[PDB]
Design a binder for these strands. Structure first.
Ligand SMILES: [Mg+2]
Ligand SMILES: [Mg+2]
Ligand SMILES: [Mg+2]
Ligand SMILES: [Mg+2]
Ligand SMILES: [Mg+2]
Ligand SMILES: [Mg+2]
Ligand SMILES: [Mg+2]
Ligand SMILES: [Mg+2]
Ligand SMILES: [Mg+2]
Ligand SMILES: [Mg+2]
Ligand SMILES: [Mg+2]
Ligand SMILES: [Mg+2]
Ligand SMILES: [Mg+2]
Ligand SMILES: [Mg+2]
Ligand SMILES: [Mg+2]
Ligand SMILES: [Mg+2]
Ligand SMILES: [Mg+2]
Ligand SMILES: [Mg+2]
Ligand SMILES: [Mg+2]
Ligand SMILES: [Mg+2]
Ligand SMILES: [Mg+2]
Ligand SMILES: [Mg+2]
Ligand SMILES: [Mg+2]
Ligand SMILES: [Mg+2]
Ligand SMILES: [Mg+2]
Ligand SMILES: [Mg+2]
Ligand SMILES: [Mg+2]
Ligand SMILES: [Mg+2]
Ligand SMILES: [Mg+2]
Ligand SMILES: [Mg+2]
Ligand SMILES: [Mg+2]
Ligand SMILES: [Mg+2]
Ligand SMILES: [Mg+2]
Ligand SMILES: [Mg+2]
Ligand SMILES: [Mg+2]
Ligand SMILES: [Mg+2]
Ligand SMILES: [Mg+2]
Ligand SMILES: [Mg+2]
Ligand SMILES: [Mg+2]
Ligand SMILES: [Mg+2]
Ligand SMILES: [Mg+2]
Ligand SMILES: [Mg+2]
Ligand SMILES: [Mg+2]
Ligand SMILES: [Mg+2]
Ligand SMILES: [Mg+2]
Ligand SMILES: [Mg+2]
Ligand SMILES: [Mg+2]
Ligand SMILES: [Mg+2]
Ligand SMILES: [Mg+2]
Ligand SMILES: [Mg+2]
Ligand SMILES: [Mg+2]
Ligand SMILES: [Mg+2]
Ligand SMILES: [Mg+2]
Ligand SMILES: [Mg+2]
Ligand SMILES: [Mg+2]
Ligand SMILES: [Mg+2]
Ligand SMILES: [Mg+2]
Ligand SMILES: [Mg+2]
Ligand SMILES: [Mg+2]
Ligand SMILES: [Mg+2]
Ligand SMILES: [Mg+2]
Ligand SMILES: [Mg+2]
Ligand SMILES: [Mg+2]
Ligand SMILES: [Mg+2]
Ligand SMILES: [Mg+2]
Ligand SMILES: [Mg+2]
Lengths: 117, 59, 137, 122, 204
RNA sequence: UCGAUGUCGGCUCGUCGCAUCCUGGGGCUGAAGAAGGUCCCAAGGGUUGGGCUGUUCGCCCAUUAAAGCGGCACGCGAGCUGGGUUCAGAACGUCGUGAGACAGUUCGGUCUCUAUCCGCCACGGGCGCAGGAGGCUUGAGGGGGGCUCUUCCUAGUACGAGAGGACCGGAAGGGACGCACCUCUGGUUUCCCAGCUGUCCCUCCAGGGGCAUAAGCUGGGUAGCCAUGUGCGGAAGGGAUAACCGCUGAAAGCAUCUAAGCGGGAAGCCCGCCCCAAGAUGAGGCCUCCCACGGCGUCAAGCCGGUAAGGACCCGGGAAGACCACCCGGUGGAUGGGCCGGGGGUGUAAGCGCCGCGAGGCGUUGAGCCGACCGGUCCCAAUCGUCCGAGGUCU
RNA sequence: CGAAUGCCGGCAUGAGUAACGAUAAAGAGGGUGAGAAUCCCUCUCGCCGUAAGCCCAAGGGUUCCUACGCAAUGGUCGUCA
RNA sequence: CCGUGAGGGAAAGGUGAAAAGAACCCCGGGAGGGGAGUGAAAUAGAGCCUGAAACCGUGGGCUUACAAGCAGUCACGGCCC
């Protein structure tokens, strides 16, 4: 027994990280992302941080963000377009809404991971 | 083909008695407030679209 | 109930505040000791501070010395049995937080890997403020 | 924590150099020996013509331990090696001198002459 | 038989004379006496104490105002002390004085389904040499044809923890009345924020 | 039992007997005391670690209060091991002309992921508890636990030529064991922080990312989980008894513990202590709630649909957890996520400036980064809703 | 015919149980479609690279290409093969 | 089909008198069905005469959550027909 602690899984470390890294990229790229509930929830916090460093905009934040999102252009958009969109918002730049119906293939329950507004 | 095997054929009664719990339970739905439709609670269904909540198509 | 931590920092009103600031450089000294009847006679313990584990009221630190051919380390709570805690060379200048590494290859090598903290020492002799002009205004 | 099999370093001039714990003399089945506790050991190494020889089954008291020793005031002491002093059947030191520091627990456990003879008691 | 409810807040240590004292801080907040058991109507004697204030309105039916002590009707339900009967108003930490010996009860932490080794601190199998598929196994559990069965509760793997546990005779190292605090000498079942009941011990 | 009941020893896990090794009571002693011997009572709890041999067993080493003897398919291989022995190879001695052989030795040799029923450990679901509910409880009856040593004080006193050396009573420490805990001590902490190599890449320098485990390596390391660490426990006390010791007392003018009646008396027995427990259908108790016939059969459900108190469903979660369950929240909201502050860990980020040809070094700087921990803040998410559920049979 | 661990066939039990075949690894956005986590495309990510790349001989025999297709064969799915 | 080979060696018959083999409509991607229609018969609708038993279901009647058994039998009693 454990879970006395936090964070989810079902992949080894390097994979689990690489995962959040990709959803993040895909989310900042499209605004709305559809994935399974667990993956969606675990995403919210990881990207909220990324955007919060954007709000700073001091380069260090930039190079910190680039560590997870390697796409220079992506970050640019992140720092010039998405970031301002909040700047006054105190956290919670991410939204997650579960859809009805599941994958008629494995029955996985899906959800929405939206960039909020 | 190995080690433990069942000793006797489980009788029809005994077999069915075990499935006394396999009975399925109905999906839980509720009337959508925006349209006339049934959908699961705390979920965005196609029909309506959620007072904006990133919905399907509609003109 | 509403602030375990708070309602715990409140019991911890056994907190000293008369002790010198120091990291993993070189402290030593101290301290009390109750032997053969009386809680008197203060024994001193000179040495390099090998570690400091912080945890509010009960953060502790260990000091290492080489007493008569044998190496010895002592763990002090930080509050209670500690009359004074003056300190030798500020030395410090340890790139590491926990320097148990000095245990296996100590000697001249220790003083070479632990150069004086040319800095914290400066603000030691500087920020001292020894002006005995008192009573003249 | 000393258990049968452990090698201690003799902190005295009885001639011995190293002894291996054979048993901890505390009860019917104590698991470990700490500073102050007595043991029976085998003399593994010894210096030419000394009060004791190798193969000798002796007794000694533990004066130093690599496992830290906690004092009721909340502090702890610990040494780089495990050392003991050869003791006779009446529990006095067979030697005359003693080297290195000894934990002070020895004082509160009776071993007075070992402590007086010790170059330092921490 | 002095008895109060409280919540485990956490533990640290203090200094008395010149020795460190591991201690468990408890919060035996103002307990509103809400009911009394009597050999006439209840058949035994006891004080249902109330604990943990507030609770907007999620109380419904058990709106036990039968006693004005309905004081917002506390959260952490009610709990009897048995063989206690104080000034029918409120039981505070004052009940205890530094130096007394209490018996504290709580629900131990839950390790869920435990292995024979952790649960019944079993020895288990070897990590090498012989086989290598029963290093954490119970071994044998019976004899042969006779008795040809297994003794009732022969210690086996299963649920472990999350149960009532009482550790006895703890010195009340102190008691801070202004804050409802209470200091015992270490060891107290359950997790911080867990409910406990502190009573008078049984030593004489 | 040969259409198969796996065989020695060990490991694991116990459980029982008592013909008792220790511990507790006691009688006799060639019992001064102390230490023994012997027999009776008594398993409640204990009954160590090693060297040798496959060994059981024994013999040693060092201790101990003691290092008990037996049963349970010489307990336990659908639990493990396979060292002994009983397949095929090979060799020695030995027997045989030989092929081969030997309760003689020697080296080597495949012990089958899936538990149906009973039993056992745990967790539910259904219905019942003769109104329905939400709480708090009694404890029939079970289970757990029961250990023991040393020293000091009585008192160097009774006893004793001496040496030695008590009872009874009273203290303080230990050892094993048990439960719980994480303050401390000490572990782990798979990405919390830093350092490092080779290579490919981003973007050339700088700064970074992947890979070199399912962590590349190294040094550290919070929460949690932990023992080596910490705190508690065995009781005390009441009752009936064993052996045993008596009081009063006949039968039997004495005597006698017995026949009548009364006592004292064990680590044992009962209760006390901790835990479970009303499926204790013998379904218990106390507190508070909601209560009505409205439509309808043989007129109190034998009846249908809304209901009531309440309850599920769904959601956000949890030192709760395999699932289920249990516990806390659901905008009348601090439940989780984020954001903020603080702990805590890393141990002076980048960038820029100065010094050095350069690797680098100063400074800004305990900086930067930063899981779980203690708390704030409705920024995001627990939108909105639905379905069950009384109308209560007898003197 | 009731038995022969009988013979041929059918259907049960175990059971919604063990399994679904290397721990190199996935994510998302488009498209197609009655329906696809499983087909197509784009972008990320991971693996092999004395290869898990390329070529020849043997063996195999149309498995090659393409258009219609999805009952079955594919350990799931299938519009794909 | 098996085996390198000598060689071994299966299973599998029946619409109806006559194809009159179900136009067309409806749900469905199809399959499959519901109507319509053929026929004396379609539970003769196509691996279709008859179509038993094991086995799997739906509906109903009696009966069961304090009992324990080679499952039956004898006796009363209740409910249903
Ligand atoms: Mg990796
Ligand atoms: Mg974060
Ligand atoms: Mg059936
Ligand atoms: Mg748990
Ligand atoms: Mg082990
Ligand atoms: Mg094996
Ligand atoms: Mg039996
Ligand atoms: Mg048989
Ligand atoms: Mg006997
Ligand atoms: Mg005597
Ligand atoms: Mg036995
Ligand atoms: Mg067996
Ligand atoms: Mg063998
Ligand atoms: Mg072998
Ligand atoms: Mg070999
Ligand atoms: Mg009872
Ligand atoms: Mg019973
Ligand atoms: Mg710790
Ligand atoms: Mg720790
Ligand atoms: Mg630590
Ligand atoms: Mg790094
Ligand atoms: Mg690199
Ligand atoms: Mg790569
Ligand atoms: Mg930790
Ligand atoms: Mg008499
Ligand atoms: Mg009597
Ligand atoms: Mg009596
Ligand atoms: Mg209870
Ligand atoms: Mg019952
Ligand atoms: Mg009941
Ligand atoms: Mg009741
Ligand atoms: Mg919150
Ligand atoms: Mg919050
Ligand atoms: Mg914070
Ligand atoms: Mg800090
Ligand atoms: Mg900080
Ligand atoms: Mg911080
Ligand atoms: Mg037949
Ligand atoms: Mg016959
Ligand atoms: Mg037959
Ligand atoms: Mg057959
Ligand atoms: Mg089946
Ligand atoms: Mg299942
Ligand atoms: Mg099964
Ligand atoms: Mg299973
Ligand atoms: Mg499986
Ligand atoms: Mg596969
Ligand atoms: Mg696989
Ligand atoms: Mg790899
Ligand atoms: Mg590679
Ligand atoms: Mg290679
Ligand atoms: Mg060819
Ligand atoms: Mg073909
Ligand atoms: Mg092709
Ligand atoms: Mg095609
Ligand atoms: Mg398929
Ligand atoms: Mg062939
Ligand atoms: Mg017709
Ligand atoms: Mg016909
Ligand atoms: Mg015909
Ligand atoms: Mg037919
Ligand atoms: Mg039939
Ligand atoms: Mg039926
Ligand atoms: Mg009964
Ligand atoms: Mg009945
Ligand atoms: Mg009958």
């Amino acid at each position: 027994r454990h879970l006395k602690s936090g964070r989810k899984l079902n992949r080894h470390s390097s994979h689990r990280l690489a995962l959040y890294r990709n959803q993040a990229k895909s989310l900042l790229t499209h605004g709305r992302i559809t994935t399974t509930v667990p993956k969606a929830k675990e995403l919210r916090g990881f990207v909220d941080h990324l955007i919060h460093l954007a709000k700073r905009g001091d380069l260090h934040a930039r190079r910190l963000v680039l560590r997870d999102l390697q796409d220079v252009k992506l970050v640019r958009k992140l720092f010039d377009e998405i970031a301002p969109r909040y700047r006054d918002r105190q956290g919670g730049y991410t939204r997650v809404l579960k859809l009805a119906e599941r994958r008629r293939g494995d029955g996985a329950p899906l959800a929405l991971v939206e960039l909020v507004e | 083909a190995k080690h433990p095997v069942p000793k006797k054929k489980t009788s029809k009664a005994r077999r069915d008695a075990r499935r006394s719990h396999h009975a399925l339970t109905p999906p839980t739905l509720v009337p959508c407030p925006e349209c006339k439709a049934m959908k699961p609670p705390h979920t965005v269904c196609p029909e309506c679209g959620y007072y904006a909540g990133r919905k399907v198509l509609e003109v | 109930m509403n602030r375990g931590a708070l309602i715990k920092l409140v019991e911890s009103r056994y907190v000293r505040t008369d002790l010198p600031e120091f990291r993993p450089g070189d402290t030593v000294r101290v301290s009390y000791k109750v032997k053969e009847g009386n809680r008197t006679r203060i024994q001193d313990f000179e040495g390099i501070v090998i570690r400091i584990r912080r945890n509010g009221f009960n953060t502790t630190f260990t000091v290492r010395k080489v007493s008569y051919g044998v190496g010895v380390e002592r763990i002090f709570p930080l509050h209670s049995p500690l009359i004074q805690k003056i300190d030798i060379v500020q030395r410090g200048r340890a790139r590491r937080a926990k320097l148990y590494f000095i245990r296996n290859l100590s000697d001249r090598e220790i003083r070479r890997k632990l150069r004086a903290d040319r800095k914290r020492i400066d603000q030691d002799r500087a920020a001292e403020r020894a002006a005995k002009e008192e009573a003249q205004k | 924590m000393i258990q049968p099999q452990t090698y201690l370093e003799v902190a005295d001039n009885t001639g011995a150099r190293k002894i291996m714990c054979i048993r901890v003399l505390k009860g019917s089945n104590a698991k470990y020996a700490t500073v102050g506790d007595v043991i029976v050991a085998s003399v593994k190494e010894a210096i030419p013509r000394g009060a004791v020889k190798e193969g000798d089954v002796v007794k000694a008291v533990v004066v130093r331990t690599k496992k830290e020793i906690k004092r009721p005031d909340g502090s702890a002491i610990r040494f780089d090696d495990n050392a003991a002093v050869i003791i006779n059947n009446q529990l006095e030191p067979r030697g005359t001198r003693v080297f290195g520091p000894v934990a002070r627990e020895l004082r509160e456990k009776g071993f007075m002459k070992i402590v007086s003879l010790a170059p330092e008691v921490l | 038989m002095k008895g109060i409810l409280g919540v485990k807040v956490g533990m640290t240590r203090i200094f008395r004379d010149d020795r460190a004292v591991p201690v468990t801080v408890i919060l035996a907040g103002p307990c509103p006496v809400v009911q009394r058991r009597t050999p006439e109507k209840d058949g035994y004697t006891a004080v249902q104490l109330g604990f943990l204030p507030q609770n907007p309105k999620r109380v419904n039916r058990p709106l036990k105002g039968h006693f004005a002590k309905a004081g917002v009707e506390p959260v952490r339900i009610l709990r009897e002390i048995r063989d206690f009967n104080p000034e029918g108003d409120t039981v505070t930490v004052e009940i205890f004085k530094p130096g007394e010996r209490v018996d504290v009860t709580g629900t131990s932490k839950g390790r869920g389904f435990a292995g024979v080794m952790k649960r019944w601190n079993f020895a288990g199998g070897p990590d090498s040499h012989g086989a290598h598929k029963i290093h954490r196994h119970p071994g044998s559990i019976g004899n042969r044809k006779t008795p040809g069965r297994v003794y009732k509760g022969k210690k086996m793997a299963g649920h472990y923890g999350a149960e009532r546990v009482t550790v006895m005779n703890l010195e009340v190292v102190d008691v801070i009345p202004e804050e409802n605090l209470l200091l015992v000498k270490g060891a107290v079942p359950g997790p911080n924020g867990g409910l406990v009941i502190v009573r008078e011990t049984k030593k004489a």
